[PDB]
CSV table of C-alpha atoms and ligand atoms in Angstrom, one decimal:
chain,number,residue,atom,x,y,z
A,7,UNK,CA,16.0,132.5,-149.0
A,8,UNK,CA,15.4,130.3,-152.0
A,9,UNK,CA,16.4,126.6,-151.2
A,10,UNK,CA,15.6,125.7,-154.6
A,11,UNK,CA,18.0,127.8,-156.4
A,12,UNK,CA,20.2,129.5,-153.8
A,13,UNK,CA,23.1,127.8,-152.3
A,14,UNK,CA,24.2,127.9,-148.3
A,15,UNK,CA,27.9,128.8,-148.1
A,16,UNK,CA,28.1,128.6,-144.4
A,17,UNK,CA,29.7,128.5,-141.2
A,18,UNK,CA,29.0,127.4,-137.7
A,19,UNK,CA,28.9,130.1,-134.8
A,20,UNK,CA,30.0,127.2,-132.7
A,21,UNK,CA,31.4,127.1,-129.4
A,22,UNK,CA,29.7,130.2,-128.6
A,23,UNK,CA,27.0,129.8,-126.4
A,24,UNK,CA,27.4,125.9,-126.5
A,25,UNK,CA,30.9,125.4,-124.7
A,26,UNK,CA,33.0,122.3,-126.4
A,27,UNK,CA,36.2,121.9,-124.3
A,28,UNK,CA,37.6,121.3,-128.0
A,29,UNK,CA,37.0,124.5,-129.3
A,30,UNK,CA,37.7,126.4,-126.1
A,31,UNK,CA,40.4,124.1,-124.2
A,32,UNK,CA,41.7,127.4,-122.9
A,33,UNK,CA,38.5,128.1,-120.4
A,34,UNK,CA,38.9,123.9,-119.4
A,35,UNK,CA,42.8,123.4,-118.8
A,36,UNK,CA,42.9,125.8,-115.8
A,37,UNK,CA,41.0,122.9,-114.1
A,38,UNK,CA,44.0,120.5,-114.9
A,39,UNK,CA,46.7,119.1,-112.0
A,40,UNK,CA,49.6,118.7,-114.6
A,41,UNK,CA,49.1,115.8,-116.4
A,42,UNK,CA,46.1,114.5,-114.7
A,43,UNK,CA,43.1,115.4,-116.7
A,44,UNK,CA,40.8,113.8,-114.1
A,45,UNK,CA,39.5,116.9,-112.8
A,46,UNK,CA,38.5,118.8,-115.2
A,47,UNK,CA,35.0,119.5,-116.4
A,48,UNK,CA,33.6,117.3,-118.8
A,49,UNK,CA,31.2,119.6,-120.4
A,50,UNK,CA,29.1,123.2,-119.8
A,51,UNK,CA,26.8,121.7,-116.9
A,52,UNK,CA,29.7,120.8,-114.8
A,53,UNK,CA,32.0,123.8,-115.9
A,54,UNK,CA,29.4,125.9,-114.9
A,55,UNK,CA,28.5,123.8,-111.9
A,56,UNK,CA,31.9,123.5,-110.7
A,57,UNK,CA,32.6,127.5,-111.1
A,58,UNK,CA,29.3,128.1,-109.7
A,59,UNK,CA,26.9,131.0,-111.0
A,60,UNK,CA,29.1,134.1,-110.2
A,61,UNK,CA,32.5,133.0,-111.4
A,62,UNK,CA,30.3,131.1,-114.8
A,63,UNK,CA,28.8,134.2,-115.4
A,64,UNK,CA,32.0,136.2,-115.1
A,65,UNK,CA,33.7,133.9,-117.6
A,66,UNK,CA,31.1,133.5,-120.0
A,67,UNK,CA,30.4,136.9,-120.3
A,68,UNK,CA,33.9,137.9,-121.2
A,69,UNK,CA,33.9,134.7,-123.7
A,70,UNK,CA,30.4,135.8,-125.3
A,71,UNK,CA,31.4,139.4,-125.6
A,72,UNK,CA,34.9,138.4,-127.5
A,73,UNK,CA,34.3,134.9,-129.2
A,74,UNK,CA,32.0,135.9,-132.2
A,75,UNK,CA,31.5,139.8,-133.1
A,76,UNK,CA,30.4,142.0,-135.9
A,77,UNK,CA,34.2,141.8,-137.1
A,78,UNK,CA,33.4,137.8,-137.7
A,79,UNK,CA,30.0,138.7,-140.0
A,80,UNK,CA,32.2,140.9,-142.0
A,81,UNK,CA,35.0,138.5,-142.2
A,82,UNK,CA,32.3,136.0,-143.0
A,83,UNK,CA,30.7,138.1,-145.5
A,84,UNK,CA,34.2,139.5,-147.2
A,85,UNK,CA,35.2,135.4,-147.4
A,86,UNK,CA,31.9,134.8,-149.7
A,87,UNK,CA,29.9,132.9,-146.9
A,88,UNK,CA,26.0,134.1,-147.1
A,89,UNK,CA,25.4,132.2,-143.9
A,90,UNK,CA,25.7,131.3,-139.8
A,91,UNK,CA,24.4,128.6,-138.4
A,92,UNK,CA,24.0,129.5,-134.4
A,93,UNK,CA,23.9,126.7,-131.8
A,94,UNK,CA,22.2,127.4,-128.5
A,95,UNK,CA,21.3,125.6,-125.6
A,96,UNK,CA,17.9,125.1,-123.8
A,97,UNK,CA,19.0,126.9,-120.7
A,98,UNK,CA,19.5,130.2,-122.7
A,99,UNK,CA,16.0,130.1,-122.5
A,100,UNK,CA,14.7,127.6,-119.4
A,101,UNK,CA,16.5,126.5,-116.7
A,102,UNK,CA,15.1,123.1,-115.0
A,103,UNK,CA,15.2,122.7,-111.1
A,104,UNK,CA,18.9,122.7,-110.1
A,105,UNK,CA,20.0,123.2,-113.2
A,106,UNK,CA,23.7,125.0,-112.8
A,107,UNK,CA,23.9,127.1,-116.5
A,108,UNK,CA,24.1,130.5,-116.6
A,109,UNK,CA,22.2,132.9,-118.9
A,110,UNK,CA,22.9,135.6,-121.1
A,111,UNK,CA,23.1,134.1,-124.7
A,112,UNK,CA,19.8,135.7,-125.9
A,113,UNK,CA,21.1,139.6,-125.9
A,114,UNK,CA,24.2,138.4,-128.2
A,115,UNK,CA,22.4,135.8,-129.9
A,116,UNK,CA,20.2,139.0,-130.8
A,117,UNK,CA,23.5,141.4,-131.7
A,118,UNK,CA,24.3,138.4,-134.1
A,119,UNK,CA,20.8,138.8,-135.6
A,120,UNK,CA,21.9,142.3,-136.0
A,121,UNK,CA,25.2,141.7,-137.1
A,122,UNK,CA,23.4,138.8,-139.6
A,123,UNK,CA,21.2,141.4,-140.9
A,124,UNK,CA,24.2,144.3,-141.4
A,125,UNK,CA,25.9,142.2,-143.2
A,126,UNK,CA,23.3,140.0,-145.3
A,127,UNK,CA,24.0,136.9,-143.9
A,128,UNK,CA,21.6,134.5,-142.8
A,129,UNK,CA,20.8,132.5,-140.0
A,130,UNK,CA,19.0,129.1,-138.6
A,131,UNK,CA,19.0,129.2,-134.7
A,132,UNK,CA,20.0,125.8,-134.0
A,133,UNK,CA,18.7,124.1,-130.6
A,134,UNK,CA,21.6,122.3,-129.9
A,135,UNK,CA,21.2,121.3,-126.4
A,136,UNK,CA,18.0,119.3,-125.0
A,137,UNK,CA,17.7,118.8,-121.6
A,138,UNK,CA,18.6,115.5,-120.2
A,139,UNK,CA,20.6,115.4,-123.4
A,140,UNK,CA,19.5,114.1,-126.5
A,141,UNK,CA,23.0,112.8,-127.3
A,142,UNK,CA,25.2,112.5,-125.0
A,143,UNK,CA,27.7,114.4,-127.0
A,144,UNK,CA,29.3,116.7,-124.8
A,145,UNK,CA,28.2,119.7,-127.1
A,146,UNK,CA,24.7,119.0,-126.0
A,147,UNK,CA,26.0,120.8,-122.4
A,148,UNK,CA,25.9,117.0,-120.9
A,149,UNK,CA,27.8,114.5,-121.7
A,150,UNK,CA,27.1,110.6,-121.6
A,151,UNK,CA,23.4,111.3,-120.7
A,152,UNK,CA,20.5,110.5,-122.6
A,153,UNK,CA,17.0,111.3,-121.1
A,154,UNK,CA,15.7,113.5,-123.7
A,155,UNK,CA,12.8,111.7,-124.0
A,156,UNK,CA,12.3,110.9,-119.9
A,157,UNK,CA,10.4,112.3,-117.7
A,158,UNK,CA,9.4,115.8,-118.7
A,159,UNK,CA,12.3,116.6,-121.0
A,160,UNK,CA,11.1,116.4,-124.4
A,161,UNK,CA,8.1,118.8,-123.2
A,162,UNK,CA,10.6,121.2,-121.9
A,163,UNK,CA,12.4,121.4,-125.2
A,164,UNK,CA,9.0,121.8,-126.9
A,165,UNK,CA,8.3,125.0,-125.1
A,166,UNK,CA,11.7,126.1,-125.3
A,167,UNK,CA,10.6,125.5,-129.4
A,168,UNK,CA,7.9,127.6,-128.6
A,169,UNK,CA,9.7,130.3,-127.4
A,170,UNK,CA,12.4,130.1,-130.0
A,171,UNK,CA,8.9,130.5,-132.6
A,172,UNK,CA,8.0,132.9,-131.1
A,173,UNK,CA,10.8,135.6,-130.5
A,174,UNK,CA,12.5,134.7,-133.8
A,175,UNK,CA,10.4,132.9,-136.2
A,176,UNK,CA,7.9,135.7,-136.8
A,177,UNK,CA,8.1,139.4,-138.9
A,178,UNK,CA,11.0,140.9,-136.9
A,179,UNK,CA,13.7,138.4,-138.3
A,180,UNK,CA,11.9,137.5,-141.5
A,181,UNK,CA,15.1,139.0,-143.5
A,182,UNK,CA,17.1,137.1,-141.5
A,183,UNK,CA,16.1,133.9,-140.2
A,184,UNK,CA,16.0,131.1,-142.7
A,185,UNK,CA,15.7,128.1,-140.7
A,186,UNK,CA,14.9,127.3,-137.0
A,187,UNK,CA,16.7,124.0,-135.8
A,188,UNK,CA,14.4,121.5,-133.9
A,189,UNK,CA,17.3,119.9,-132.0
A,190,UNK,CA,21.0,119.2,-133.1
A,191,UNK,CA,22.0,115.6,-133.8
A,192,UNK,CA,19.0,113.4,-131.6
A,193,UNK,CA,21.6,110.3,-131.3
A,194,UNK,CA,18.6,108.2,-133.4
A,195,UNK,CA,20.0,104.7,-132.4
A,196,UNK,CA,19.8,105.0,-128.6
A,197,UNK,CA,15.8,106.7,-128.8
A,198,UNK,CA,12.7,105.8,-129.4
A,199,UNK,CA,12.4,106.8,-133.3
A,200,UNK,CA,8.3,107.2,-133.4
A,201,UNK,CA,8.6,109.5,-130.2
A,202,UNK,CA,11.6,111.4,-131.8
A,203,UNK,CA,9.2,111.8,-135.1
A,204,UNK,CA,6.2,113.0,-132.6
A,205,UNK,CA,8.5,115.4,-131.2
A,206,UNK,CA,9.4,117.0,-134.8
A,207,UNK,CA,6.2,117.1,-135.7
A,208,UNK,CA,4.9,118.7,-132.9
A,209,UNK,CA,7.5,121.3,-133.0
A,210,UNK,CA,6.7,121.7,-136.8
A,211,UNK,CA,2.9,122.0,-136.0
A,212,UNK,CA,3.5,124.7,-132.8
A,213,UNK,CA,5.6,126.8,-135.3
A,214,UNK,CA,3.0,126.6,-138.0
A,215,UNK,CA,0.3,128.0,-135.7
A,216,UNK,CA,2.0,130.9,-134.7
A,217,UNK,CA,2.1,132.3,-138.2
A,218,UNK,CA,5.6,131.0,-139.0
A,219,UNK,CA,6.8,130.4,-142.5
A,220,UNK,CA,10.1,130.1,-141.3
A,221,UNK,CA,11.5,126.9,-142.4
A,222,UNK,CA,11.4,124.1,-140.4
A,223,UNK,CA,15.2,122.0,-140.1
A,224,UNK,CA,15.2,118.5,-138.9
A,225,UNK,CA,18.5,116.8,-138.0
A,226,UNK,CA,18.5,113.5,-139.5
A,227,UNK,CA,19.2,111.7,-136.9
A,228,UNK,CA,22.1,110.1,-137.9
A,229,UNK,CA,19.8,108.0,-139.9
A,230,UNK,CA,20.4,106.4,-143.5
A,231,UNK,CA,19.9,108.7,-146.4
A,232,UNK,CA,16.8,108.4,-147.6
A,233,UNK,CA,15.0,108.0,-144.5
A,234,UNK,CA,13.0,111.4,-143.9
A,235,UNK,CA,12.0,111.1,-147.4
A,236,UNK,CA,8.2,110.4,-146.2
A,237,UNK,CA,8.1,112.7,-143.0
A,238,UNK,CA,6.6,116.3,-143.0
A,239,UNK,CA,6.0,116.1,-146.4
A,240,UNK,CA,4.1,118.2,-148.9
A,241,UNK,CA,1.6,115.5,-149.2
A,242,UNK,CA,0.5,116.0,-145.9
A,243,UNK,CA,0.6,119.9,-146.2
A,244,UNK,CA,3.4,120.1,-144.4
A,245,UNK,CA,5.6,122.5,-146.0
A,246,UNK,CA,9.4,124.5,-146.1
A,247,UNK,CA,11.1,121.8,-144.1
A,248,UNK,CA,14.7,121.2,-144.9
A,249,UNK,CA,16.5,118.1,-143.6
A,250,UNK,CA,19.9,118.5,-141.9
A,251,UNK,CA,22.7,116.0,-142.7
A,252,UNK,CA,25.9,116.0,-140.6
A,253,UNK,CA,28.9,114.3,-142.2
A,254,UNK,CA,32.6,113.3,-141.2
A,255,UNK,CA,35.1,110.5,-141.2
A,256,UNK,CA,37.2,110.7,-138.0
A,257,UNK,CA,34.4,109.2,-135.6
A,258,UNK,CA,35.6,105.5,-135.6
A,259,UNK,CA,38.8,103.3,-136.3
A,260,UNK,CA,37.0,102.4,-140.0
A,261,UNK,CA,36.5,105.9,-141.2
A,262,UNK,CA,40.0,106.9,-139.9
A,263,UNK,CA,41.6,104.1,-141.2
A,264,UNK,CA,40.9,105.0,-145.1
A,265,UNK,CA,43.0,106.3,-147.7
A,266,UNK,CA,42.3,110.0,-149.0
A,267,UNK,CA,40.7,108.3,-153.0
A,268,UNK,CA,38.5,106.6,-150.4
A,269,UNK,CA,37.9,109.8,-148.0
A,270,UNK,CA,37.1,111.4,-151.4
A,271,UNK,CA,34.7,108.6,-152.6
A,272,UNK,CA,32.7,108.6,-149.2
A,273,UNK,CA,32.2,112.1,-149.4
A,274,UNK,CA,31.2,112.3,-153.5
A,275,UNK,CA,28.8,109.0,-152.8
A,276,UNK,CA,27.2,111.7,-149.7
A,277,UNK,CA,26.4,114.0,-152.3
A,278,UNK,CA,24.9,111.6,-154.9
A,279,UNK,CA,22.9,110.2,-151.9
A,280,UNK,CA,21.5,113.7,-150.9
A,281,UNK,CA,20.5,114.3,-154.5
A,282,UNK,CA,18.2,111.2,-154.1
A,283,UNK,CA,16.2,112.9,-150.9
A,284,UNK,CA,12.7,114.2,-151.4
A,285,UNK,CA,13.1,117.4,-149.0
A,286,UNK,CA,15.3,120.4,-149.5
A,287,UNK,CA,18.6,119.3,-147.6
A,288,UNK,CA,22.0,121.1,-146.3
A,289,UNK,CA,25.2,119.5,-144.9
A,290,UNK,CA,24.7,121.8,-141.6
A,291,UNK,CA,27.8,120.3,-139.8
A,292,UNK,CA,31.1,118.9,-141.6
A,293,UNK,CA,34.7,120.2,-141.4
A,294,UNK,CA,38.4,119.2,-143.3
A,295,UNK,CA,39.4,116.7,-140.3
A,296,UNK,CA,40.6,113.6,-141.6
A,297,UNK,CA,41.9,112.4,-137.9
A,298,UNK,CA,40.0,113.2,-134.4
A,299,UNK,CA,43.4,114.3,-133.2
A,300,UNK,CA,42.0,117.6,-132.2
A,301,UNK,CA,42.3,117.3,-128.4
A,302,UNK,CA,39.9,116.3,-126.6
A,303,UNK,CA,37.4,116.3,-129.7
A,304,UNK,CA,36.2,112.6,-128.3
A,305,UNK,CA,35.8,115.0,-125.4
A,306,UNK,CA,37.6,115.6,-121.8
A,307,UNK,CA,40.1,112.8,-120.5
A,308,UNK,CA,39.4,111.2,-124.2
A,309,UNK,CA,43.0,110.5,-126.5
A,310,UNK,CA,42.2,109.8,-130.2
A,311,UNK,CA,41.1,106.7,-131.7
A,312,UNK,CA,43.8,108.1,-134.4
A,313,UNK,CA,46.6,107.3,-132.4
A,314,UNK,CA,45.1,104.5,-130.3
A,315,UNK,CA,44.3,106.4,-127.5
A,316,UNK,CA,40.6,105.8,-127.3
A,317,UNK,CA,37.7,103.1,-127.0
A,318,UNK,CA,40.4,100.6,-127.7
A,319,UNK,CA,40.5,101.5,-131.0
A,320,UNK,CA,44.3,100.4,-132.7
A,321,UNK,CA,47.1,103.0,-133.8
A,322,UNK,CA,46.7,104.2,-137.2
A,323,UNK,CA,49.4,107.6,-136.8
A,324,UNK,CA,50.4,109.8,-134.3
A,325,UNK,CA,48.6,113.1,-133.4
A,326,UNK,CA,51.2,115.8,-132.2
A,327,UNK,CA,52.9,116.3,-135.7
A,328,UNK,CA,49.2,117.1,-136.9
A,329,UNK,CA,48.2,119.4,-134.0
A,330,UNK,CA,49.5,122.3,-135.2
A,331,UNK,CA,48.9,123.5,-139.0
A,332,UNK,CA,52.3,125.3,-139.7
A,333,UNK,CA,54.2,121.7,-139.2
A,334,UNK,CA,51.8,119.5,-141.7
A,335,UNK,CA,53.6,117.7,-144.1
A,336,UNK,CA,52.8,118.3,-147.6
A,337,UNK,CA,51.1,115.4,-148.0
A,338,UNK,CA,48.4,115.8,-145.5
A,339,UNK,CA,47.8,119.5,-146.4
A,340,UNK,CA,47.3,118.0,-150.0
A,341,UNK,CA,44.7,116.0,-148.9
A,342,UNK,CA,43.1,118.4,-146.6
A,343,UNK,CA,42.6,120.1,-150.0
A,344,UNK,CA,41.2,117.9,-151.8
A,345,UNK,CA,38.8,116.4,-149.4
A,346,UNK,CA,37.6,120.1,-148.5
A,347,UNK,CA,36.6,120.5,-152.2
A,348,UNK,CA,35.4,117.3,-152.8
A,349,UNK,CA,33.0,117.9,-149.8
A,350,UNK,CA,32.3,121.1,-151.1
A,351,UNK,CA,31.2,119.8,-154.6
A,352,UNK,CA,29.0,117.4,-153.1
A,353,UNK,CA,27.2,119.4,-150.8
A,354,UNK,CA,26.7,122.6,-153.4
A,355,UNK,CA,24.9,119.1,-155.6
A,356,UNK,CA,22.3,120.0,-152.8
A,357,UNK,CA,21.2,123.0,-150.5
A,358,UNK,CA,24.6,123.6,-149.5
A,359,UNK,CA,26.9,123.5,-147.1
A,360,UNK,CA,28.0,124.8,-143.7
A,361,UNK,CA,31.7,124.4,-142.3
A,362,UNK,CA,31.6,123.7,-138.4
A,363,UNK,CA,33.3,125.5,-137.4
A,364,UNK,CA,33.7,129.2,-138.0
A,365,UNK,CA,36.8,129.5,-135.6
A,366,UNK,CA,38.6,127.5,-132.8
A,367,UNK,CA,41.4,128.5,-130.2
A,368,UNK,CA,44.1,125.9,-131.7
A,369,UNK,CA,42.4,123.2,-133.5
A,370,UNK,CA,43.3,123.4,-137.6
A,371,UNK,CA,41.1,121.0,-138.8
A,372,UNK,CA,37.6,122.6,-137.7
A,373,UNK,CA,38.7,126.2,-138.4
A,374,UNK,CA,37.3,127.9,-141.5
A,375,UNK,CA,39.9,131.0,-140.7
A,376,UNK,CA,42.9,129.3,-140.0
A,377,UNK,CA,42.2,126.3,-143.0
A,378,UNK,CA,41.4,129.6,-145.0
A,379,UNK,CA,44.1,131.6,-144.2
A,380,UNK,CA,46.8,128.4,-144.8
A,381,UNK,CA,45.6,128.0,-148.3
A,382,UNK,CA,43.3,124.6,-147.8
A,383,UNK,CA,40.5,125.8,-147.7
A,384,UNK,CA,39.3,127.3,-151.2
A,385,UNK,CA,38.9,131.1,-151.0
A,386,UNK,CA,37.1,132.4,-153.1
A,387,UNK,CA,35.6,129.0,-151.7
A,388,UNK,CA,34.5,128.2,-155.6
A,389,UNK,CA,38.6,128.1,-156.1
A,390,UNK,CA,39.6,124.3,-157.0
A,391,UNK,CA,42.6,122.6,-157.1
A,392,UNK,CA,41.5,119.4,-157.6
A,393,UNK,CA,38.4,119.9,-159.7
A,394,UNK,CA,35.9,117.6,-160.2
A,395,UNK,CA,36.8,114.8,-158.3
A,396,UNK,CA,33.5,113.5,-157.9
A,397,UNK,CA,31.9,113.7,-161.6
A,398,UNK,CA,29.0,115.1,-160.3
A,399,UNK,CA,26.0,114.6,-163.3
B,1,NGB,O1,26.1,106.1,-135.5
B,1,NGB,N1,25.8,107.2,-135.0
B,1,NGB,O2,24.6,107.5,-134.8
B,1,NGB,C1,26.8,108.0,-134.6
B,1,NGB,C2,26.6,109.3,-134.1
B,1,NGB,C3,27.7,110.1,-133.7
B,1,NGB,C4,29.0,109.6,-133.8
B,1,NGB,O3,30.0,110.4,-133.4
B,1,NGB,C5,29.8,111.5,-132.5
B,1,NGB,O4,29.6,112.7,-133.2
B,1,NGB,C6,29.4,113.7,-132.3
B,1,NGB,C7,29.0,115.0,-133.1
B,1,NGB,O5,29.7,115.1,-134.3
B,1,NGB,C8,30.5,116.3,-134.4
B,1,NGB,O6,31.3,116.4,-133.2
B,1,NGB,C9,32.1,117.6,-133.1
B,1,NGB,C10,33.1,117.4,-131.9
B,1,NGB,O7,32.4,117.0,-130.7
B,1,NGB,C11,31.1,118.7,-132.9
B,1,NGB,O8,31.8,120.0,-132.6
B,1,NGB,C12,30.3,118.8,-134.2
B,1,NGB,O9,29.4,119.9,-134.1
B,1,NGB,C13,29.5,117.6,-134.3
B,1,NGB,O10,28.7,117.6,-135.5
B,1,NGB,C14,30.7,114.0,-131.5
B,1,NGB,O11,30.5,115.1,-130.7
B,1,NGB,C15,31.0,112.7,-130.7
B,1,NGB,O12,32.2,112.9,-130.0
B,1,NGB,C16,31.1,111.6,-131.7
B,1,NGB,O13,31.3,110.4,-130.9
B,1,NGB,C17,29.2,108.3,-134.3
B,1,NGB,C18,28.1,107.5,-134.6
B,2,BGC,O1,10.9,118.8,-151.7
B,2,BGC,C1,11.7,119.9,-151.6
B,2,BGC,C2,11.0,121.0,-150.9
B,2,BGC,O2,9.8,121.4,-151.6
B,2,BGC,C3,9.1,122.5,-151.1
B,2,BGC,O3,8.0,122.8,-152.0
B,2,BGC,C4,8.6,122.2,-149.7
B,2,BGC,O4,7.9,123.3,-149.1
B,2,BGC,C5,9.8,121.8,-148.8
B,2,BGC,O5,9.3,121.4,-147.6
B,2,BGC,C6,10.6,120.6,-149.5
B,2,BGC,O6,11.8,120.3,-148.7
């Protein structure tokens, strides 16, 4: 891959072998007493935990075998995408003590490679899940835990690294792996930033020695723009490291509460800031939400800040007229539009660009198929409606 002339037109393989009761509500509502939302798993720990191995494995076999297949790499490749980004968890690989995941997601994580390959699409393997969490997200497999860097947890993630470099960042997926992902959104705020910078530097060095020259991807954190601009840098030899920036506007009241010319002018101001950075960089997570309506994308038991139905956060409109694409008014397909290419313009300004998510059972605003196949989002995805709306120099 060329990162200095190519651009990444890309989707997310998510909710694959990550689960996100979001993407997947169907394999979390069974756990529901009516109305009473109580009881239900809060993330893939305590699904599996709850099913326990047998049932889990069951399940998840049947999901892995149907959710993403060579039929989606076509797709992907007939839509104009040259990309996947795949999240997996540590426990595809390592299991710690009493740890209640299942395993299975290297032989399709390999198909995909496969499929990747057939299809010329490629790939970063994204570590999205640490253990102990390095989030707290519930797509890191645990939510509202953060001991990534207790006790023996960041180690474990480093050899997990090491396995990752080793099965896939060497001559057999050279054609096909253009990026392996250090770990998925560290939460930056609640860690300790100088042992979250060790970590990425470790994990850069370990790959280095094993004869890699597969590029190196480092989340940002959620740090300002700008601030990996000095890290793993040429300077210091340390070379073919791109920097991962995740953007949306639907995670607090503020963001949610703007008006689409200032949805727009967030997202061209992200591109002009990207242009700014020192490494190669790529907009590895984003999607067309403009509410976090989606249920339960706050996560299990969690209304939407949208509708003031979370972390106290005030009513700005209601969420069931926007839960289903086919009864959007005009308006807010219009600016589902617009701030889909606006996003797009400014992340091409960079390395690119990569939807999450590639598919979801019923939630509109992180599909690329369904936003595709309803007209919003652009296909060929160079199509504009609204052109230049961020005067991009
Ligand atoms: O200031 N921060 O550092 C910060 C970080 C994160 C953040 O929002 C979180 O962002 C997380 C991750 O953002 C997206 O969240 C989506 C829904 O969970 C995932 O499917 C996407 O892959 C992911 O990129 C969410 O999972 C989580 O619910 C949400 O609270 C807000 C502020
Ligand atoms: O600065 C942009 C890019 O320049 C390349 O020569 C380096 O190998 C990358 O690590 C870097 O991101």
């Amino acid at each position: 891959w060329d990162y200095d002339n190519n651009v990444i037109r890309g989707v997310n393989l998510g909710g694959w072998f990550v689960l996100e009761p979001y993407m997947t509500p169907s394999l979390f509502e069974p756990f529901q007493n009516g109305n009473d939302q109580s009881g239900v798993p809060v993330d893939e720990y305590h699904w599996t935990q709850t099913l326990g191995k047998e049932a889990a494995l069951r399940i998840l076999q049947k999901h892995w075998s149907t959710w993403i297949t060579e039929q989606d790499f076509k797709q992907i490749s007939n839509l104009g995408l040259n990309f996947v980004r795949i999240p997996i968890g540590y426990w595809a690989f390592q299991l710690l003590d009493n740890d209640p995941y299942v395993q299975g997601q290297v032989q399709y994580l390999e198909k995909a490679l496969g499929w990747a390959r057939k299809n010329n699409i490629r790939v970063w393997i994204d570590l999205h899940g640490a253990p102990g969490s390095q989030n707290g997200f519930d797509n890191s497999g645990l939510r509202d835990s953060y001991n990534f860097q207790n006790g023996d947890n960041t180690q474990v993630t480093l050899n997990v690294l090491n396995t990752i470099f080793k099965k896939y960042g060497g001559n057999e997926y050279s054609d096909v792996v253009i990026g392996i992902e250090l770990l998925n959104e560290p939460l930056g705020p609640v860690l300790n930033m100088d042992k979250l910078k060790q970590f990425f530097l470790d994990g850069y060095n370990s790959l280095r020695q094993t004869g890699s020259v597969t590029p190196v991807i480092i989340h940002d954190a959620f740090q300002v723009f700008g601030y990996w601009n000095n890290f793993l840098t040429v300077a210091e030899g340390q070379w073919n490291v791109v920097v991962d920036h995740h953007h949306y506007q639907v995670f607090s009241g503020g963001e949610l509460s703007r008006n689409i010319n200032d949805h727009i002018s967030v997202a061209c101001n992200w591109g002009w800031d990207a242009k700014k950075e020192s490494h190669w960089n790529v907009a590895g997570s984003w999607s067309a939400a403009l509410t976090d309506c989606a249920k339960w994308l706050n996560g299990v038991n969690r209304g939407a800040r949208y509708e003031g139905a979370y972390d106290n956060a005030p009513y700005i409109g209601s969420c069931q007229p926007l839960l289903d694409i086919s009864q959007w008014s005009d308006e807010h397909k219009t600016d589902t539009r617009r701030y889909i290419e606006a996003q797009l313009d400014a992340f091409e300004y960079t390395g690119g660009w990569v939807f999450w998510s590639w598919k979801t059972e019923n939630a509109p605003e992180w599909s690329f198929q369904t936003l595709t196949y309803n007209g919003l989002f652009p296909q060929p995805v160079t199509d504009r409606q609204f052109p230049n709306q961020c005067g991009f120099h």
